[PDB]
Design an enzyme around this catalytic site. Sequence first.
Site, PDB file in Angstrom:
ATOM      1  CB  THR A   1       4.462  10.543   3.869  1.00 37.99           C
ATOM      2  OG1 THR A   1       4.143  10.376   5.215  1.00 37.99           O
ATOM      3  CG2 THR A   1       5.081   9.210   3.435  1.00 37.99           C
TER       4      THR A   1
ATOM      5  CB  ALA B   1       0.371   7.715  11.505  1.00 39.35           C
TER       6      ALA B   1
HETATM    7  C1  LIG Z   1       3.862  12.764   5.575  1.00 37.96           C
HETATM    8  C2  LIG Z   1       4.837  13.047   6.742  1.00 37.96           C
HETATM    9  C3  LIG Z   1       2.775  13.826   5.756  1.00 37.96           C
HETATM   10  O1  LIG Z   1       1.938  13.750   4.606  1.00 37.96           O
HETATM   11  C4  LIG Z   1       3.205  11.295   5.707  1.00 37.96           C
HETATM   12  O2  LIG Z   1       2.013  11.208   4.921  1.00 37.96           O
HETATM   13  C5  LIG Z   1       2.886  10.771   7.122  1.00 37.96           C
HETATM   14  C6  LIG Z   1       2.698   9.251   7.067  1.00 37.96           C
HETATM   15  C7  LIG Z   1       3.297   8.541   8.314  1.00 37.96           C
HETATM   16  C8  LIG Z   1       3.119   9.288   9.651  1.00 37.96           C
HETATM   17  C9  LIG Z   1       2.696   7.124   8.424  1.00 37.96           C
HETATM   18  N1  LIG Z   1       1.593  11.234   7.617  1.00 37.96           N
HETATM   19  C10 LIG Z   1       1.465  12.026   8.682  1.00 37.96           C
HETATM   20  O3  LIG Z   1       2.396  12.511   9.327  1.00 37.96           O
HETATM   21  C11 LIG Z   1       0.023  12.246   9.095  1.00 37.96           C
HETATM   22  C12 LIG Z   1      -0.591  13.391   8.337  1.00 37.96           C
HETATM   23  C13 LIG Z   1      -1.952  13.247   8.627  1.00 37.96           C
HETATM   24  C14 LIG Z   1      -2.493  13.853   9.762  1.00 37.96           C
HETATM   25  C15 LIG Z   1      -3.841  13.691  10.063  1.00 37.96           C
HETATM   26  C16 LIG Z   1      -4.652  12.923   9.231  1.00 37.96           C
HETATM   27  C17 LIG Z   1      -4.116  12.312   8.100  1.00 37.96           C
HETATM   28  C18 LIG Z   1      -2.767  12.471   7.802  1.00 37.96           C
HETATM   29  N2  LIG Z   1       0.051  12.526  10.527  1.00 37.96           N
HETATM   30  C19 LIG Z   1      -0.610  11.783  11.421  1.00 37.96           C
HETATM   31  O4  LIG Z   1      -1.299  10.793  11.173  1.00 37.96           O
HETATM   32  C20 LIG Z   1      -0.386  12.258  12.839  1.00 37.96           C
HETATM   33  C21 LIG Z   1       0.698  11.392  13.403  1.00 37.96           C
HETATM   34  C22 LIG Z   1       0.950  11.856  14.846  1.00 37.96           C
HETATM   35  C23 LIG Z   1       1.504  13.283  14.877  1.00 37.96           C
HETATM   36  C24 LIG Z   1       1.937  10.883  15.499  1.00 37.96           C
HETATM   37  N3  LIG Z   1      -1.583  12.088  13.656  1.00 37.96           N
HETATM   38  C25 LIG Z   1      -2.395  13.106  13.942  1.00 37.96           C
HETATM   39  O5  LIG Z   1      -2.272  14.261  13.528  1.00 37.96           O
HETATM   40  C26 LIG Z   1      -3.541  12.698  14.851  1.00 37.96           C
HETATM   41  C27 LIG Z   1      -4.433  11.695  14.088  1.00 37.96           C
HETATM   42  C28 LIG Z   1      -5.726  12.389  14.034  1.00 37.96           C
HETATM   43  C29 LIG Z   1      -6.846  11.735  13.557  1.00 37.96           C
HETATM   44  C30 LIG Z   1      -6.936  11.009  12.370  1.00 37.96           C
HETATM   45  C31 LIG Z   1      -8.166  10.449  12.017  1.00 37.96           C
HETATM   46  C32 LIG Z   1      -9.284  10.630  12.833  1.00 37.96           C
HETATM   47  C33 LIG Z   1      -9.185  11.368  14.004  1.00 37.96           C
HETATM   48  C34 LIG Z   1      -7.970  11.924  14.356  1.00 37.96           C
HETATM   49  N4  LIG Z   1      -4.223  13.932  15.327  1.00 37.96           N
HETATM   50  C35 LIG Z   1      -3.852  14.536  16.462  1.00 37.96           C
HETATM   51  O6  LIG Z   1      -2.938  14.143  17.189  1.00 37.96           O
HETATM   52  C36 LIG Z   1      -4.668  15.793  16.816  1.00 37.96           C
HETATM   53  N5  LIG Z   1      -3.932  17.021  16.404  1.00 37.96           N
HETATM   54  C37 LIG Z   1      -2.761  17.229  17.267  1.00 37.96           C
HETATM   55  C38 LIG Z   1      -2.009  18.424  16.757  1.00 37.96           C
HETATM   56  O7  LIG Z   1      -2.882  19.501  16.917  1.00 37.96           O
HETATM   57  C39 LIG Z   1      -3.972  19.408  16.007  1.00 37.96           C
HETATM   58  C40 LIG Z   1      -4.812  18.214  16.462  1.00 37.96           C
END
Ligand SMILES: *[C@@](C)(CO)[C@](*)(O)[C@H](CC(C)C)NC(=O)[C@H](Cc1ccccc1)NC(=O)[C@H](CC(C)C)NC(=O)[C@H](CCc1ccccc1)NC(=O)CN1CCOCC1
Lengths: 250, 240, 235, 222, 211, 195, 244, 231
Positions: free
Chosen positions: E1, E49
């Site tokens: 992000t 997210a």
């Molecule tokens: C920028 C883009 C990146 O830093 C931003 O910070 C964005 C903020 C927006 C989305 C609000 N953050 C993300 O894109 C964020 C990065 C991240 C990932 C994981 C933990 C913390 C931060 N991405 C997510 O939150 C994604 C969003 C999905 C793709 C819609 N979610 C995941 O990756 C999920 C959440 C997992 C999780 C969090 C906490 C506890 C347990 C699980 N994970 C998965 O879907 C599993 N993942 C799938 C891909 O293969 C690896 C396993």
Amino acid sequence: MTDRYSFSLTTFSPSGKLGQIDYALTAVKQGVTSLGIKATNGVVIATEKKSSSPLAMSETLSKVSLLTPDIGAVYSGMGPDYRVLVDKSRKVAHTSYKRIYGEYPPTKLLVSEVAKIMQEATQSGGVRPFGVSLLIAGHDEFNGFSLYQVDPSGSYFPWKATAIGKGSVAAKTFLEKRWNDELELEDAIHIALLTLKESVEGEFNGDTIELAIIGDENPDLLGYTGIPTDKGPRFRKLTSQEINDRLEAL
Amino acid sequence: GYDRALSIFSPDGHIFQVEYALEAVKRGTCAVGVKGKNCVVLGCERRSTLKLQDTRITPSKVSKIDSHVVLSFSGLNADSRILIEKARVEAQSHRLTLEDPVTVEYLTRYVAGVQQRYTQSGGVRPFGVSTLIAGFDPRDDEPKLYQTEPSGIYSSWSAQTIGRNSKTVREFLEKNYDRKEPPATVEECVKLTVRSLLEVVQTGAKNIEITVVKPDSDIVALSSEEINQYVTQIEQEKQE
Amino acid sequence: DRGVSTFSPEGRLFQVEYSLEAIKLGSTAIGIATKEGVVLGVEKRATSPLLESDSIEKIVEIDRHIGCAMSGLTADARSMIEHARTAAVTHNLYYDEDINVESLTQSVCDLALRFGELMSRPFGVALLIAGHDADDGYQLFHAEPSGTFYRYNAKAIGSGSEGAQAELLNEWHSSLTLKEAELLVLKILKQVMEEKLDENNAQLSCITKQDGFKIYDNEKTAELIKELKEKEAAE
Amino acid sequence: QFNPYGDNGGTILGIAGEDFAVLAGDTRNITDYSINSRYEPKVFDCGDNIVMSANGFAADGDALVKRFKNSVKWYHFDHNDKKLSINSAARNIQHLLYSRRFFPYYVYNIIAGLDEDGKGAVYSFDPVGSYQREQCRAGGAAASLIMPFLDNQVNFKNQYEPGTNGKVKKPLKYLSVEEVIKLVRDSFTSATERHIQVGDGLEILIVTKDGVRKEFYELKRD
Amino acid sequence: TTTLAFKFRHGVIVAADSRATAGAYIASQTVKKVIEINPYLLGTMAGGAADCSFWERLLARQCRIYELRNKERISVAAASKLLANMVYQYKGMGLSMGTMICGWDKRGPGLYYVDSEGNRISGATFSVGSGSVYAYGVLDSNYKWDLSVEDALYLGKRSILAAAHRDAYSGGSVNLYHVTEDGWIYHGNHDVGELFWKVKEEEGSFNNVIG
Amino acid sequence: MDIILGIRVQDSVILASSKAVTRGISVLKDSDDKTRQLSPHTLMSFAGEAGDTVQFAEYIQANIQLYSIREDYELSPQAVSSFVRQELAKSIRSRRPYQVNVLIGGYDKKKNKPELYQIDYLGTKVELPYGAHGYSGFYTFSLLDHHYRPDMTTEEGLDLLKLCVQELEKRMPMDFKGVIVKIVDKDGIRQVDDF
Amino acid sequence: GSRRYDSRTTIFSPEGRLYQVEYALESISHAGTAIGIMASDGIVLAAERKVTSTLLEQDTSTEKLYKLNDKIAVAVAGLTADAEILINTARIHAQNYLKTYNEDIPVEILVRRLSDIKQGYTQHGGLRPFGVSFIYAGYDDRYGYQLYTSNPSGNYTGWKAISVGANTSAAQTLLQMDYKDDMKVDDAIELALKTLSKTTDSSALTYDRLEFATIRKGANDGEVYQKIFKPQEIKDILVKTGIT
Amino acid sequence: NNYDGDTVTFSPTGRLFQVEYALEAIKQGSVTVGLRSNTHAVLVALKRNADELSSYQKKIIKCDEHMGLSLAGLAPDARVLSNYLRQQCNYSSLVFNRKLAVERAGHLLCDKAQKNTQSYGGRPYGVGLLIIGYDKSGAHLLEFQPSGNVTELYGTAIGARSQGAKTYLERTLDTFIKIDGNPDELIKAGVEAISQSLRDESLTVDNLSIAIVGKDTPFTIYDGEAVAKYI
Ligand SMILES: *[C@@](C)(CO)[C@](*)(O)[C@H](CC(C)C)NC(=O)[C@H](Cc1ccccc1)NC(=O)[C@H](CC(C)C)NC(=O)[C@H](CCc1ccccc1)NC(=O)CN1CCOCC1
Ligand SMILES: [Mg+2]
């Protein structure tokens, strides 16, 4: 189920009286006479072994009880209430003192703990007061010999000599004439036997009388040797024979 | 735990325990509250049956809840301490969580809510207390004066009295207090508050306490001499 | 003494029936439902002239689409309003939508019979819950301390209730406008009130789909009172 | 040490039309290199014109679906048989997922149906409840194989109009159900070729105002 | 992000990208990282997210019950603090949130940074996310207080673009918001692909890139 | 947070605290006030882990303000410092301890004396003429050991503080963005707006 | 069920009084009189033991005057057992304060705490109240010498001179008559004993029927000393003032 | 008299008066009828209004796709018991993938009501329920009393003036039991049965409430113009 009596059963009446405490004191009045006398070098406590049946072995029923090695107790009133109080008194002497300070509590503080237990039965929910008055005789290093009375209310007073129960009014008068501050322990035992004879109807001997003293240390009753500072219990219960010997010189 | 329902409805739709709590308030010493144009004054009766009292250390009738809000009461004294403590804790809790001091209306609503809770909770009796809560909201110059009672109802007042002989002093205030033109100054507001208590108090010596609360956390308690000057001027005008 | 949850020989809960007597002593509150909106009005009933009447809050917002008027021991209503507001906002959290007026009313009524030896007694207050939703449109409910709730086209609660209800019986029809309903509440309030009705001792409110729940200003109500006087003098 | 999670493979795909929506998924269930079932349904009709598929760890997916179906049942009881809108279901599912924020449902989840204006809707969820309405979304093992293809063939990404040379984009013309089902079958046939956890069968659920219809197509069994 | 926000004469600008990532895989590119709490309050999302979405939606419900009990819109400071205290309970438990609570209240425009670590800071300029470091360069160099709404909107937009270009985990589209005393105003969704080329030509920047 | 200093002079206590707040590789703010007024004549500066610091300070502040209202009386700096220490000594054996170090500077109106207390996160209390937390004291104590007199004026205390800060700015690798300075004396608490 | 046997200890009368509190006060009116007098240079505590016996061990006895800490003492009127429960709580509170703030507890704060405990028994729990009235004599560096009283209602007030227990009406009148503001400890000692001597139900006031205590700055330089009088010392002060 | 203060007290003749008083609340309630054939089971309920401006209180509640009930007495108590049935039906489905037997549903209601009759502090339920359902052993009708007694029947009625409808069903027993594969005729028999309990008032469009469940018929409630067919 659940104890749903979470409210007080002892309450103030319009006149300011706490009825259940007064009634408990009435039960104490009906009880068998017991007394205590303090000497210069000891304390004596005594009572009558009122046997309910001649088939009953009255030796098994102990009205005079050891609380600590240097503290003893006797009562007037309801026997079962006394028996449980002795159990609690023995335990609280350990839990609230000996396990902390590594020594037995002084008389006045053990009395204070027993008093507290009796006070709580006068205010806590769903209980009646204890129907007993206790006489607690004891010795400790810094306070010397002492004798305390404890009532159903939880109030306690120190005495030079006193009596409770059936013939307490007459017995207290008898003690007032005989008591002085120069009495030896044997003199106090003699006075105790004289005082107790007045309230007893039937047989008057070692088998019908229960008597104990707080006096000198008894190393023969300790059960072990090797530690100079441990010299044995000051509490001793007089035998049937020892009582009869003093009844000949009566 | 003791769960007994003490506050309950009677056949005619009354909660007697709450109504008997109002009788305890009726017995209590008189308290009065008057709000001027730019201030609020809280007057309190001190019964002169108790002399040999140490006035330095004796609990004062008006209590500060925060630096900008005060609380006076009528009824059971011991009960009032519990409400005041709770109100003080809530005032700090509000500053801590919301970063603003409580409004007078909010603090009143909390105290009133506590009083109500004790009218439909098991094992407890209602508070034998009615309160007058006064002060100024943060960054506001509009005077605030509220009243609460054992049932838990609360409301805002231009001027109000509670406690013993409150019926008499309320009668006085209703004819003397004008809404279109309230006491413009502090003097006029204090004078009217002392006048109202003089209808009931007895002697104007150590029986009257006065506490003036002004905007921006400006709270002060008048002394015996300062009040005595008001008592003197009132009666000298009366001799005519 | 006797249990709090005791049945009478007729099959009614003593305490619930006694709380209904407390509600009869309360100040009057009236509600009228139309196809253009629901109107809510109350008698303030100040105990003294020194009491600042605008602090008397007997009409209350639960959500943007739900309003509420009260009658009886009004202090008891505060925890009910609090629960209602929480229920309304919580449902918006879980389902991303407004909550149905009936569902909100049902949630409030679930508290009613939670008393015994939970709270120590029933609530001593009745509520008129008015609102709008997309499914059933403009609605008016009467929530009692028995846990029962009836829907109404028009309803009056409080001290002048049976006299007002008989008047609402004759006056209500399915084609009432909002303006007509406003005047009708003012008319019936003026009829059952002890003191003379004005903008300071009576309060109006409404709920429309467009503007939501609104409490009327004293200046706005004053004009509706003046409009009422003239139309009664017109014949 | 006991591992409470597992990977049962599978891949799912949701596409939203103008007045319809599809939710597709393969029927293969696996652990490691073994096949458990060649036909184990993964996409369900949950009621109120909503279809759902949650998987990855099959046991967590089965539980989530089971709970949401239950949530729909109780929504009717508590709110006078009111129809649960797709946006309301999505928000409800977020709260089912976040209730286990500290012991997550190990699943990818997609729901599909129609919005309150009658237009097609697809919502996508991460394991802990972050959700997004989208036009096109693939989830699961072969999600990364399929999504770029859908960006190209559904949203016309990187596609411009000939003659202009990058100055004017390809206009976003809507797709029919028949055109969409072709993209779905081609997506899964391509994924079956290059992903070992994808194959055996393909079940598609189509949602219109008329209701929910099913279609089934075989895939390669190797 | 990448997200940013800043106070200025005519309110507060709020801007954010739309990319969501799962490792190197771009899972989504249509994510709304600005949440509308009330017509006068915005919240930004960065990190988890799910975490950011849940807690800020739960905050919006706290802010609403506040308005009902108090007949008064909540302040920016109180709102930011409710969030901070909520996430502080779960400190060390694994939450990942980087948020900004933007709004206009009685004290004028307000802007607070709040995170899962425990920080709660008032400030005139913030940027949080993996691409924040790139955005700060453009902000700090061009930020005034006497900035026109038109120029302020462009600055926040241009700042996200800078980060979206360099940061691999930032991009997709730019969402703009402007918060006034009459409430917030949405200023559109801007595809970075198209926006980049436009800015390159009109501004002359990104000379190193060919187009 | 980073550097917090304290010096007790003849008639006042001076507290100097850094302005920087840092999250990873980025300076979030350069004008942070790491202090809370506990009472009109008692000031507490603090430094430690994010969240813990402000949560603890504001919790202490609320407790002292509550005491002041209840009794209509200001607690002595010694009484406050003892209260704070107990809260930290209680905290250190809890499930999740507050990771906070504090300095409490106050003027005792009864004794007419300034007082400075240093308390670390374990609940280790010490009364001092001058003190510091973290890596601050390592650079500054040699200068204070040299130049400090107990009969110093407030102006001399500030000059010695400038010397301490100049040394920090030369030898510390981290940029802490200067310090906010506050003086606690008989007339209350005030901030030196130019430093 | 159990409801049948509940006395309901925490309810109002129709007149707005608390039944049990009023009846507890009735109990206290039969207790031995206790008097407290505050002077400029100290405080006096005097109290009458109830109909004693010659066989009572007086020198080791304590039923009226108790020590809460080095600066604060109390005189008791009512049920002694009830008083000891509260006294031990007050001793613990004083030590808690000292541990927390490293300063001796102000007198009023200790008094308020005990009075709040008493109040609680009148409003909730369904238990009988404590049948005890205290006179608190204490010193701190804020208000100096202080006298307070508390009763079963949990209400407390400050005093220059005060009596609790039996014959308070008569005792308070006598104190109000002879008390003056510029009074000293030695004079206050005389006033306390003279008041007891006139109000007592006994035939004559003797050493064995009294408990006595002073709190004096009459300790070497700026500090306070508590003196619980011994039987022989009470006998001497009775002769000195000219009562025996 | 002296033995009606609470539910925990038997009278000298072995009666429980608080339970009997709760039973009285049912008799004050509006009439409702239940009857069944071998294929279907039907509930018919006369709804009651407060006045002409008020709505007509709902009497029938759905518990599951194959089960539901009608109420008579305290409506909130019916909401509590029906909520319990909803949960129990639901527990059976989620855990055992099994539709809850109507007979077992009756046993659960009996045991829930019983606990309120033997313990101090609580009170008996003040409502009577008629449960209908279709399970693996066909159609069923149950009658619930808050004493705890549950009874399986061919037909019955509870509420005010319910004796008239109960007599009619006792005559018609041989006829309506044979109405198999004909829902409309079974409802007709129910509407004709409840008509025997009417005085002064008659069955109008917003007055009548009908519910049915059967072999290939989920539990559905009919109100408004949907019951005009049967008037
Ligand atoms: C920028 C883009 C990146 O830093 C931003 O910070 C964005 C903020 C927006 C989305 C609000 N953050 C993300 O894109 C964020 C990065 C991240 C990932 C994981 C933990 C913390 C931060 N991405 C997510 O939150 C994604 C969003 C999905 C793709 C819609 N979610 C995941 O990756 C999920 C959440 C997992 C999780 C969090 C906490 C506890 C347990 C699980 N994970 C998965 O879907 C599993 N993942 C799938 C891909 O293969 C690896 C396993
Ligand atoms: Mg394959």
